[PDB]
Amino acid sequence: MASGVKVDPSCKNAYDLLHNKHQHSYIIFKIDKNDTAIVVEKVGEKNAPYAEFVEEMKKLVEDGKECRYAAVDVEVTVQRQGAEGTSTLNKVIFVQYCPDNAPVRRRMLYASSVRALKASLGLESLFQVQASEMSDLDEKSVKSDLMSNQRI
């Protein structure tokens, strides 16, 4: 669950860019090179419809049983403090997309990449969710779960 997985500066730069600078909305990560480096798979502009998020990722997954990490800084709204109606907080959620049937070789690197990116990407206090199928990544879970822990 932890090993010498290389963290890339570019994707980390993108984290601050999306989270604080709101230059981007989401960024997908994958393990690049044999020397194992976590790097950008796909970045999305600040205005990115939920449909396009699925679309862009959908096409790159069909090659095989691929595992991809997704960190998205999205502002969902609740009814709470701030204003009586809409309490909006951008909670950058980390949703790792990987079926269990993924190749054990990559699976091991994947598992050892978890702790590495967890703290190192500034996702220390942020939530980490797992999704194995494209049906499960539907807002029915992701939107609902994140909406609660916006201020929790």
Experimental method: NMR
CA dihedral 59, 60, 62, 64 (to 10 degrees): 180
CA-CA distance, 108 to 105, in Å (whole number)?
Answer: 5
Q: Which helix (H) or strand (E) holds 96?
A: strand 87-97
| CA distances from residue 149 to 20, 37, 60, 123 in whole angstroms, order as listed | 19, 30, 30, 14
Architecture of domain 1-152: 3-Layer(aba) Sandwich (3.40)
CA dihedral 91, 40, 17, 55 (to 10 degrees): -60
The answer to whether the CB of 102 falls within 8 A of the CB of 65 is: yes
Rg of the Cα atoms in the chain: 15
Closest CA to 74 of 31, 121, 127: 127
